[PDB]
Every structure is written in C-alpha cells, then in structure tokens.
Design a protein around this motif. Structure first.
Motif, short mmCIF file in Angstrom:
data_model
loop_
_atom_site.label_atom_id
_atom_site.label_comp_id
_atom_site.label_asym_id
_atom_site.label_seq_id
_atom_site.Cartn_x
_atom_site.Cartn_y
_atom_site.Cartn_z
N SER A 33 32.75 35.83 33.88
CA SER A 33 33.22 37.10 34.41
C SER A 33 34.70 36.98 34.75
O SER A 33 35.22 35.90 35.01
CB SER A 33 32.42 37.51 35.66
N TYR A 34 35.36 38.13 34.74
CA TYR A 34 36.81 38.22 34.91
C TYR A 34 37.10 38.76 36.30
O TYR A 34 37.14 39.97 36.51
CB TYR A 34 37.41 39.10 33.82
N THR A 35 37.31 37.85 37.25
CA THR A 35 37.74 38.25 38.58
C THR A 35 39.22 38.61 38.53
O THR A 35 40.05 37.80 38.09
CB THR A 35 37.49 37.13 39.59
N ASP A 90 44.67 33.89 31.48
CA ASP A 90 43.57 34.86 31.54
C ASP A 90 42.22 34.18 31.40
O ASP A 90 41.26 34.54 32.09
CB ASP A 90 43.75 35.91 30.45
N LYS D 1 41.26 35.33 37.09
CA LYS D 1 40.30 34.35 37.59
C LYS D 1 39.03 34.35 36.75
O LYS D 1 38.53 35.40 36.35
CB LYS D 1 39.97 34.63 39.06
N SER D 3 35.18 33.55 36.73
CA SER D 3 34.07 33.40 37.67
C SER D 3 32.77 33.19 36.90
O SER D 3 32.61 33.65 35.77
CB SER D 3 33.95 34.63 38.57
#
Lengths: 149, 35, 50, 49
Positions: A33-35, A90, D1, D3
């Motif tokens: 997932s992209y926080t 990224d 980020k 995750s």
C-alpha cells in the motif's frame, strides 16, 4: 492451475528462490500500500516482505501466486531467474536484482551482457543533492558546449 | 615525370575526397550534437 | 483575451524565428563525400546562430 | 511510504515448485482397489476433510 498447487502457508516458492540462492529464509507475504500525505493508494499485488526488503509477487491468470522473478539473460549464457524488488523513493516501480545490486528493468533483461555490460540503476530514494544535479545537467550542457566549440 | 605528376594529382583528389568525407562527418557531428 | 492573443503572437514569432534559423543552417548528407553538398547553409557552424 | 497490509490467502494461493505431483497421484492411487487412477489432477476438498 496447470501446475500442482500448494498453499502459501508453506511458502515453498520463496523457500526455493531464497535457499537455492542462499541469501535469506522464509518470510510472510502481505499486500503493498502507498502511504502518502494525499492518501492515494493503489495495490500492486500481494508481494513478499523479507525483513525491511520487499520483493514483488503477482497472481497469475489461473490463480497462481508467484514471486515476480525476472528471467534476465546473463553473461553466463543462461537466463538467470532472480526475484525482483522495489525501486525509487516512491517504491511503486519494480526493479531487478542483478549482480548483487538493484537495477532498473529497462535494458539488460532478455539479452546477453556481451551486448550491454552494465545496466542503468534507479536510486532507492530521491536523487542525491538536487541543486547540484541541476548544476550537473548544466555541466552536461557545458560538455556538449565544449564538444560543439 | 608524367606518372609522378599523374599519381600525385590522383592522390590529391583522393585526399580531397577523404578530407571532405571527414568534414561531412564533422557537419553530421554538429547536427547530432544540435539534436 | 488580450493576454492570450499576445501569448499566441509571441510563441508564433519565436517559432518563426526558430524555423528561419533551422532553414538557414540547412545541410544535406552526401554518401561519397567528395565535396560539400550544394544545399548548404551559408552560416553553418558559425557562432552567430548558435 | 510503503506500507504492508495483512490479508488472507486469495484462493488456494499456490506455489511454484510445490510437492511432487507424480508421487502425489501415485500415493492417491495407492489406497487400493482394482482401478483408482484419477482423471485430471488431484485437488483439495472441504466436505471430505
């Protein structure tokens, strides 16, 4: 599945890859997932997480879930199958681990290193000292200027 | 000598061709470096 | 509207200048390379346009 | 980020090398009977166990 199926509880594909390479052991598989501050997030796929490192793994059409192991043609004459990682600050981009270090997936895969010896790599984060790299782009323009002159 | 001047002039023409080929290669260098 | 039309005129003028410079630095490649081609820009390689 | 999200297995969640399938079918046919060869491949069921 055309192949014989064993659940990812045993993680025999990661076991095979890592142990046959002889680098690390079994580790779980999680969704990526992209926080981000804006909060956008797109799911690349259920990929393996070995400690800090995160290796891309994708689900096939027949439901097969396999680590994204790039089969890149090497200088030995045989297509070396090496499991891939993330690239860039990224982390969205997929990169190939060759010669013990990370490289972008642009060129070297699919042909012998006799043609292209060294592959271009992607920095693991934002590129170092951006103002000096603008100065370096100007220095590239100045090298072209020296050649032109 | 007739043959001396003859082959000197032919070598001069060949050198003109080669030097102009290198000059055209330099002009193509200029064009590719312009790109 | 006035700023938009001024921008259009400015970019058109710059494009025309670039086109004139490109046509003025025209060249033609010749395979034999015996002599310079007839279709050559007079100010080719000069410091002026560059 | 980057995750990590914990999620269950999507389907059977198969693997690459897996357990040997020829001996898998041979063991499946080794229970007994006159003919016990399995059409197709051998999979997993829930009602049987």
């Amino acid at each position: 599945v055309k192949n014989v199926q064993v659940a990812n509880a045993d993680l025999t594909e990661a076991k095979a890859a890592l142990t046959a390479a002889g680098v690390t052991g079994t580790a779980s598989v999680v969704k990526m997932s992209y926080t981000d501050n804006n909060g956008k997030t797109i799911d690349g796929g259920l990929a393996v997480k070995v400690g800090d490192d995160y290796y891309s793994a994708t689900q096939n059409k027949d439901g097969s879930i396999s680590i994204n192991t790039t089969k890149y043609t090497a200088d030995d004459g045989t297509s070396k199958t090496a499991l891939n990682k993330l690239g860039g600050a990224d982390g969205k981009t997929e990169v190939v681990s060759i010669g013990g270090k990370t490289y972008a997936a642009s060129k070297a895969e699919g042909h012998n290193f006799k043609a292209q010896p060294d592959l271009a790599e992607a920095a693991a984060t934002t590129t170092e000292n951006p103002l000096q790299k603008i100065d370096a782009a100007l220095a590239q323009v100045d090298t072209l200027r020296s050649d032109l002159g | 000598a007739g043959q001396a001047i003859a082959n000197r002039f032919t070598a001069n023409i060949k050198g003109l061709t080669q030097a102009s080929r290198n000059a055209n290669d330099g002009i193509s260098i200029a064009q590719t470096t312009e790109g | 509207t006035k700023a938009k039309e001024a921008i259009k005129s400015w970019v058109d003028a710059y494009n025309s200048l670039v086109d004139t410079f490109s046509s003025l630095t025209k060249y033609t490649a010749v395979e034999p390379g015996e002599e310079a081609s007839d279709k050559n820009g007079a100010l080719l390689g000069d410091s002026v346009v560059r | 980020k980057v995750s990590d999200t914990a999620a269950t297995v999507t389907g059977y969640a198969d693997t690459t090398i897996a357990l040997d399938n020829s001996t898998f079918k041979a063991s499946a046919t080794g229970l007994g009977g006159t003919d016990q060869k399995i059409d197709g491949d051998l999979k997993f069921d829930d009602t049987t166990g």
